[model samples]
Target chain A: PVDVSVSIFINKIYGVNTLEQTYKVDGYIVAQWTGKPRKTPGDKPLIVENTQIERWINNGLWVPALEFINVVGSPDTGNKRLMLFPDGRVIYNARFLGSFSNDMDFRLFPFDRQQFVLELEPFSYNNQQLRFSDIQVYTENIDNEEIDEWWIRGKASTHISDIRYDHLSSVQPNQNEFSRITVRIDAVRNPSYYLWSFILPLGLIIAASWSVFWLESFSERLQTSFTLMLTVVAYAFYTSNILPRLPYTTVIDQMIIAGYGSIFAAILLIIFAHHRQANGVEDDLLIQRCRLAFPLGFLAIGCVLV
Target chain B: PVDVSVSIFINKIYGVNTLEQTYKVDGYIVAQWTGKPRKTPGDKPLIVENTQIERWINNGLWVPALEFINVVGSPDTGNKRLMLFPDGRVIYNARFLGSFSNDMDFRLFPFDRQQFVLELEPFSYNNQQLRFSDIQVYTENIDNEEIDEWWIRGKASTHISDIRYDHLSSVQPNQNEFSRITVRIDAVRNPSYYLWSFILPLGLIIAASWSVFWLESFSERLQTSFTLMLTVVAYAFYTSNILPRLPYTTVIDQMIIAGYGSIFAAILLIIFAHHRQANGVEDDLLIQRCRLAFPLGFLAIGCVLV
Candidate 1:
C-alpha cells in the first residue's frame, strides 16, 4: 500500500440534461504518491491499465472514487490519465463528464448561489483502512474557461465528512463507515452575453410591446398589444429552449411572465378606463397619468424582487 | 403443460418525471390461461410468491414480462392480484405503476400529441416457444376525459415483431432474436385546466399589466407597470409550480413570456411618449385614444392567436 496525493481541476461545468436528470462536468483528476524506484520485469517502471484499476476497486483494494453527493443522476466519464513517480508516489489524472441532481429553487437563478460538490473516498475501504488526510480544489474563472451553452463563474467552499449510507449494506453497524471529502465552488452570472443578447434586446422589445396603448384608436391599441403578445411568446420560446428546466420559476422566467401580464392588464384597464362610461371620459386624466405612474410603479415593484 | 393468455389494460398514464427520466403509469394486467384441474390441496389454487415467480421465469418457463416502451424511467409497482378458475383458465389482474424513458419534445406542450407505447413478450422464449397469438388495447375519449389527470378512452394501435438489440447481448447473430408485441395509444389535449386556470387568468393579468401605460405622468407610467410586472412574475411562479418541467417552451409558457415583454415594452414607450417633447401635449389626443385602441387592438390580436 502507498500514500497518494490527489488534486482536481475543474475545466467547465454546464449543459444540464433535464430528461436524464444529469449535468455534464468536464475536469481533470490528479493523484500522486512516492514509492521506492524499482525496475519492472520489462526493465521499465510498473504500469497498470484502466481494467486493472477497476479490478483494484472491485476487490476492496484502495482507489479513490469521488461521488457527487447531490448530483441527480450519474456523471459520465470522458478522458483519463495516470502518472506514477520514481519514488513511492503515484499520480492519477482523468477528465470526467457527469450529470448531478439537487434540490434547487431557481426563482433567483442566474444570480443564485449553487453548490457544486464532490464526495471523495476509497471505493471500498473503510475510514481506518484508507483515509483522506487533506484535500484542496481549484476552480478557474468563468471568463477564462472555454465558452459553451451555459455561462458559469467559479466561487469557493469545502467540507469533510465521515458518512454512512444506511440503505446500502447489512454489515455490522460501523463496519461500513466511509470518509468523504466535499469540494464546492460558487458560481455567478455571466451577465455580459445575456445583458446584450437577451436582457437588453428583450427589454426593448417589451417596451415596444406596450406601444399599442399609444395608438389613437381602440382597434389600434387592442390589436397592437396582441402582436406584442405574440412577440413576447416568441422570445419566451427562444429563452426556454436554452435554459434549464426547474420545478419552480426563475428570475428571468418571472420577468417574462410579468411582461405578458402588464400588456394584457393594460388592455383591460385601457378598455375599462375608457368604455366603463360612468362618465364620457371621466378617468381620462387618471388613465393618461397612469401611463407614467404604472410604469414607474413597476420599477419600484421590481426593485423589491431582490 | 399450461396455456396462459395475458392481457394488459392501460388505464391512465401521466406524471412524467424529467429528473429521473421516468413516468408514472396506472393500469391493470389481466392474465388468463388453462391449467390442470385438481382436487383440494387445501381447497384452493396454488399461490406463488415473487421469488417463485422469478424461478419460473428463469427456468425457460413461459412468463410474459411486458415493458413500457415510451416510459421515461423505471415504473413503480403498485397493487397486485391473481385469479384462478376451476376449469383450467387462470386470470391474474394487478395494478402496475412505473416510470419509463423515451424521446420527447415539449416545445408545443399543452397542445402536444404524445404516444404511450408498451412492449410485451415471454421472458425466456423466442418467437415459437412463447407465442403471442393476439392482443387488444383500449384508450378512451379526448374531450370528456379531461376530468381526470390522465385518461384512456380509445383502442390502441398494435403490432408484433421480431427484434434484436445489438448492444445488449453477445449471442450468435440470428439466434439472439426475440419476439415482441407493441401497443401504441394516441392522445389529445385536456384543454380544460390549462385553458381556464392558466391561459384565461393569465390573459386577464396581462391586460391589467398593460393598463399601466395609461397613467399621465412619466414617473407614474414607468413606476406602476413595474408592480404589474411583479404580479405577472408571481403568477408565473404559481403556474410553474404546477406544470411539468420540459425541455422546450410550451404554449402556456410562451403566453406567459409574452406578458413580460409587453409590460417592459410599454414601460419604455410610455416614458418616451411623455418625455419625447416632439408631439408633447399636442399628442394628448393620440395618447388618450390609445386607451381605446390598445383594448380593441388586443381583441383583434387575440383572434389571430387561434
Candidate 2:
C-alpha cells in the first residue's frame, strides 16, 4: 500500500450562497509520496512545473489524480508542480479556486455559525492500494476576523479516514474501502453591518408605531395607523430585497412579521376604541391608555422570541 | 548571459489604501530560463518544491533573486517551486501576496480611474549577466468587474525595458543598464453604492433646505435653518466616518461643502428677508420668491461643478 501525506493552504473564502448552500474557496494543495530513488544533477532534488508535469506524466511518471468530492462541477486549476528527489520522495503541488457544496443553515442569519468543508480522495485508488498518512491546513490569522464578512473561529480541523462502500460488483475483502481526507473550518458571520443598517431601523419603526395611541383625536390616531402599516410593508420590501433568499424564515423575517402584526393589531384597536364610544365623536380614555400597554406587551413578546 | 521569461497570474487585488497610495495584490510569478542539461530518472524533468528548493540552492544551484522594486516592504511569499528539465530549462514559480506602492489619485473617488502596477528587476544581475526576455500577465476575466469594488477595463499591460543607472562605481558603455519588467492594470471604482447612498441623500437634504422659504412666518423660516445646519453636520460626520481617508478632498467632500454653503446662505437670506420688511409683520412676497430661485441657482451651480 502507498502512503500519501497531504496539506492544504487556504488563502480566501467568500461568495457564500445561502440558497444553494455553497461557498468559494481559493488555495493550494500539496501531496507527497515515496517512490524508488533515481540519479539527479549533483545528487540533488529536481523540480517540474506547469505544462512539463503533464509531459512527465505522459512519459510514464506515476502521478495520481486527487478529486474534490464536495466541489461543484470543476475547479479552476492554476499552476501544477511535481518534485522529484534523489531519495525516492515525490511531491505534487497545485493551486485551485472552486466552489464547494455544504449543508448550511442560515436561520440565525447575521449571528449564524457555519462550517466550510472539503473532502478529498484518490480518484482511482482504494484504501488497499493507497492510504492517507496525515493531513495539515494553513489558514489566515485570528485577528483577520473583523476585516471580512465571515469570522473564522479557530484553526482548521483535518482528518484522514477510510470510507467503506457496501454496493459492489465483485465482493473482495476490503476492496470497497477508500482513504479520504476531510477538512473543516468553523466560522461565524459578522453581524455589525446588518445590526446597524437593518435591525436598528426595524426596531425604530416598531417603536414609533406605538405612538399612534398618543394622539388626542380619533381621526388623527386612526389615520396614522394606515401610514404605519404602509411603513412596515415598505420595510419588509427593503429587507427582502437585500437579504439572501432561503426556503425557511430568518430572525429578521420573524421580526418583520411581528412588525406587521403589531401594526394590524393597532389598526384593530384604534377602530374598536372609536366605535366603543356610545356617544358620537367622543373616545374612551381607558382604551387610549394602551399607548403604554401595547409597548410593554410588545417588549415582553420580543424578549420571549429572542 | 541568461535570458529569463516571466509570467504573472494575478488572482486578486484588494485592500486599497488611498492615503498611503498602496494596494494589495495576490498572485503567482513564474520565471523560466535555460541551463545545462543533467541526467534524470528515466530521462524526465524533475520538480522541487518549498523547503527542498532552498536545499538545492545550498547545494550550488544558480537561482536568481528577483525583487519587486515598487513593493512597500517584503511580500508574504507562499509556495515556491523550481523545475529542472532534462532539456536544459529551469523554471522558478512562486506565490506572493504583497502591498504594492503606486502614485494613486482619488480626487474623483467613486468615479476615479486607477492603475495597479508591479515593477520587477534582478537584484544582483545586470544586462551582461542576466536579462528579462519577455513578460506575460493573466488577470481576472472581464465579466468579474461588477462583483468587486474596482472594475478592470482591459488586459494587463506589460513591458520589458532597460534601465540605465547614471550613478555607479564605474562608468562603462552599456554596463549600467539593467533589465526590468513593468506590469500595469487599469481599473475604475464602482460608483453605484456611493451614488445611491451618499449623493442621493445629500441631494435630498439640499433640496429640502430650500423649503425653508415656503414657511408663512419669518419665525418659522429663520428657526428651521438651524436644524438644516445640524442635519448637514450630522451627514458630514457619517460620510467622513465611512469613506477612506484621503489627503485631498473628493467629489463627496465637495458636495458636503456645497450642502453647508446652501444652508448657511439660506440662514443669511431668511434673516435678511425678515429684517428687510419695513413694516414689522408684513413680509415682502418678492423675497419669498427666493424659494424657486434658490433651487434653480443651486442646480446651475451643481452643473458647473460637474
Candidate 3:
C-alpha cells in the first residue's frame, strides 16, 4: 500500500436546491502519494469520465468522497474534471451544480441568505486511515460584483473537522469516522431585472391609471375606470408569465394583490362619492379631492412595498 | 442458450413538454423465456433487485433491449418486476414512465395531439443470430373506461415488420435486421383543470374590473382605476407564480397585455373627453356613451385573443 497525504483548497460554494437535496460546489481536491519514480510516458495527463468514477466508487477505491453536510435536499452533479500528475500528486477539480435541502422560505427570494456546505471523507477508508491534513477556504464579498442572474462575491467562510455517524451499514467500529468541510457565501438582490421588467412598467401603468379623474361627466369617469381595471388585469398576466412558481407568496406578489384590492376599493368609493345625492350634481369636495389623494395614497403604498 | 420472447404493450402517450423536450408515456413490458424445469425450491418465485438485473445485462445475457425510436428526450423508467417460474417459462413484467421528445407547440397545450413511438432490439446479438420468429403488438381502447388517467377508447393501431439500420459499429451484412412494432392511441383533453383553475378565475377578475365604471364621482373613478391597475399587477404575479415559464406569450398572456392597453387608453379618453372641450362642463355625449361602447369593444378584443 502507498502512503498517501491529502489537502484541499475550497474556492467557492453556492446554488443550494432544497427539493432535490443538492448544492453546487466549486473547489480543488489534492491527493499526494510517494512511490519509486519511473521515466517513460507521454507528457499529457490522463482523463477520466463519470462512468469510470462510478466503477472506482463501487470497487472500494480509497478516493476522497465529499458530501454536502448541511444540504437540505439532494444535490445535482454537473461538470467534473480530474487531473493526475507524474509527481505523485493528484488534483480533482470540478464544477458541481446541485440542489441542497434546507427549510427555505422564498417569500423574499431576491433578498435571502442561503447557506452552502460540503461533507468530505474517504469513500472506502476511515478518517484515521486517510485523514485530511489541512483545509483552506477563499471567497470574496459579492456586494460590488457585476450583477447578473446570480451575483456571487465574497471571501468563503469555512469549517473543517471530524464527523461521527450514528448509522452504519455492515462495519460497526470506529471505521465510519469522516472529515467534513463546510463553506458558506452571502448574497444579495440584483434588482436590475425586476426594476426594468416589472416595477418600472407597473409604475407607468399606475401613473396612467390616475389620469382617470381629470375626465368630466360621471359616466365618462366611471367608464374609464373599467378600462383601467382591464389594463391592470393585462399587466397581471404579463407578470404571471415571467415570475417563478413558488408555494408561498413573495413581497412583489403581495404588492400586486394590494394593487388590485386598492383599485377595486377606489372604484366603489368613486361611485359612492358622485351619486349619493339628487341628480348627482353635488359632488363631495372631500371625496373629489381623491384625485390628489389617490396619487399620494399610491405613493404611500409604494413606499411600504420594500 | 435460453430462448426468450418479448412483447411490449403501449397505453396513453401524451403530456409533451416543448422546452424540456420531454413527454410522458405509460406502457408495459412482457418477457418470456424457458428455463430447465426443476423441483420446487419453494412454492414462491424468486425476486431480484436493480443491481442483479444490471449484473445480468452486463454478462452478455439475452434480454431484449427496447429503445424509444422517435423519442426526443430520455424516458424515465418506473416500477419494474421480474418473475421466475418453476415451470420452465420465466416472465419479466414492468410498468414504464418515460419522457419522450417530439416537436410540440404548447401554445395550445390543452388541445393538442401528441405522438409516441418505441424501438425494440436484442441487446448484444445481430438480427440473423438472434432472430424473432413472430412479434405482435396488443392495445385496448376502453374509451368509456373510467379506470385510468387516460381514456384508451380507440381501436388498437399496430405495425409489425422488419427494420434495418445502415450505420452500425460491428456489422454483419445480412444480420442487421430488427423487428419493429408501432402502436398509437388518440385522446382529448379532460378540460377539468384548465377550465376550473385558469379560465374561471380569469373571468371573475375581468367581471370585477368592469364594475369600476359603476362609480359616480370623477375622483372616485380615477383614483379607483389606479387601485385597479395595481390589482392587475397582483393578479399577474399570482398567475406567474403558479404557471410554467415559457419564452413566448400564451393566449392568456396576450389577453393580459390587451387589458393594460385598454385601461391606459380609457384613462386618456376619459380625461380628454372631459377637459379637451370648449368648456369643462360641455361633455361629449357620443364619447360619454362609452359606458355602453366599451363592453362591446372589450368583447370584440376578447374574441381576437389566440
Arrange candidates by DockQ, highest first: which order? 3, 1, 2
Q: Model 2 chain B: which ten-residue window has the lowest total lDDT?
A: B128-137
* Whole-model lDDT values for every prediction: 0.53, 0.66, 0.53
Model 3 C-alpha lDDT per residue in residues B46-65, reported as the tens digit of each score: 66565577654543333444
> Among all windows of ten consecutive residues in candidate 3 chain B, which has the lowest summed lDDT?
B128-137
Task: Tell me the deviation in Å of residue B104 in model 3.
Answer: 5.2
Chain B, per-candidate TM-score: 0.68, 0.90, 0.64
Best by TM-score: 2
Q: Which of candidates 1 and 2 reaches a greater lDDT?
A: 2
- Residue-wise C-alpha lDDT for candidate 2, range A1-306, written one tens digit per residue: 777777787777889875445689887888877877887677557887786775565445667667665565457668987789888889888888876766665546678777887778765455524444343445545576667777546566777767774432123677658887788888787778878887887766776777877776644553355456445544554654566643344566566666755665665575466446575434477675666787777766656676
Please state what fraction of the native interface contacts candidate 3 reproduces: 0.08
Q: Higher-TM-score candidate among 1 and 2?
A: 2
Angstrom error of the Cα, residue A284, model 3: value is: 15
| lDDT measured at residue A1 in model 1 versus the true structure, 0 to 100 | 36
User: What TM value does model 3 have?
Assistant: 0.47
